[PDB]
Amino acid sequence: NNEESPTATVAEQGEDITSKKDRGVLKIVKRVGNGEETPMIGDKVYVHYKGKLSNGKKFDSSHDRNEPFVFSLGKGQVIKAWDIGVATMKKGEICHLLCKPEYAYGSAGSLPKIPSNATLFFEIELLDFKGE
Amino acid sequence: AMDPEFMEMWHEGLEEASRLYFGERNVKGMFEVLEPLHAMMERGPQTLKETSFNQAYGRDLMEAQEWCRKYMKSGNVKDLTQAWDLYYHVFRRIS
Numbered sequence: 574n575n576e577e578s579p580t581a582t583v584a585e586q587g588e589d590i591t592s593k594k595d596r597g598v599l600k601i602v603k604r605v606g607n608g609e610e611t612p613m614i615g616d617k618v619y620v621h622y623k624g625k626l627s628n629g630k631k632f633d634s635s636h637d638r639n640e641p642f643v644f645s646l647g648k649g650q651v652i653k654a655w656d657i658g659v660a661t662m663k664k665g666e667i668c669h670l671l672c673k674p675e676y677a678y679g680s681a682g683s684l685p686k687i688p689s690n691a692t693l694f695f696e697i698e699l700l701d702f703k704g705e
Numbered sequence: 706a707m708d709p710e711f712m713e714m715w716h717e718g719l720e721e722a723s724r725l726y727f728g729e730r731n732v733k734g735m736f737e738v739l740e741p742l743h744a745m746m747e748r749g750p751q752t753l754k755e756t757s758f759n760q761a762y763g764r765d766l767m768e769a770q771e772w773c774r775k776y777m778k779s780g781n782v783k784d785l786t787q788a789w790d791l792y793y794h795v796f797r798r799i800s
């Protein structure tokens with residue numbers, strides 16, 4: 574009841590990591606990684622994540638432990654916020670991303686889980702990444 | 706070693722189904738385009754290359770299909786996430 578909200582924290586303190594600085598994707602680092610390098614365009618990336626609506630309603634809980642979630646970076650396989658956000662991460666890093674609908678699912682949403690014009694919160698741990 | 710046709714059909718169908726489901730919110734369309742692919746795996750006389758495919762991915766594809774049947778009976782959307790996890794895993798192995 575009187576505790577920190579991770580979602581409010583990224584909304585009110587997160588750095589804007591869009592190139593335009595349009596507030597579309599905001600980032601807070603929870604745990605600093607060890608890596609020198611960040612993942613590059615076309616890399617295969619492995620993560621744990623979970624996702625919540627900005628109102629607190631969870632929409633993804635089952636990918637945060639155990640088998641990694643894999644995707645190819647910078648390809649439009651995933652929402653724009655992740656292509657921007659994950660590209661800033663180092664190996665071992667955990668961050669929170671707050672994603673405006675223009676960098677997520679827009680006015681169409683992805684119902685039933687994602688309503689139209691939804692701002693999304695993710696926690697992501699970058700596990701590892703590969704060139705090939 | 707593994708059937709080129711089965712590999713190409715699942716790659717194409719899984720890609721279509723994902724666009725129907727994630728792109729168009731078309732669950733019925735998703736089930737329809739994958740249904741004859743599952744029925745292929747199940748039905749009799751099989752070659753050596755298709756037997757090999759079925760050995761590599763058949764359990765996961767069967768389980769993915771069962772989660773879809775569960776979804777139909779219950780309406781539990783988590784049954785679809787379970788199915789897509791398995792479909793994606795197979796999609797990645799064959800790409």
Ligand SMILES: CO[C@H]1C[C@@H]2CC[C@@H](C)[C@@](O)(O2)C(=O)C(=O)N2CCCC[C@H]2C(=O)O[C@H]([C@H](C)C[C@@H]2CC[C@@H](O)[C@H](OC)C2)CC(=O)[C@H](C)/C=C(\C)[C@@H](O)[C@@H](OC)C(=O)[C@H](C)C[C@H](C)/C=C/C=C/C=C/1C
Pocket residue numbers: 622624632633642644649650651652653655683686687719720723724727785786787789790792793796
């Ligand atoms: C069971 O768990 C689901 C993930 C769920 C779905 C529902 C959403 C709420 C969510 O809960 O994830 C979620 O938290 C979320 O918002 N995600 C997933 C994690 C990355 C960020 C975001 C996302 O972009 O999802 C993605 C979002 C829902 C759809 C895409 C958003 C961007 C847009 O440009 C794409 O247009 C094409 C569509 C889902 C994915 O990350 C998967 C991997 C990618 C796709 C389906 C498409 O790229 C597809 O395009 C043909 C492909 O090329 C893939 C490889 C083809 C194979 C057969 C399909 C694999 C399906 C995997 C599904 C998985 C693991």
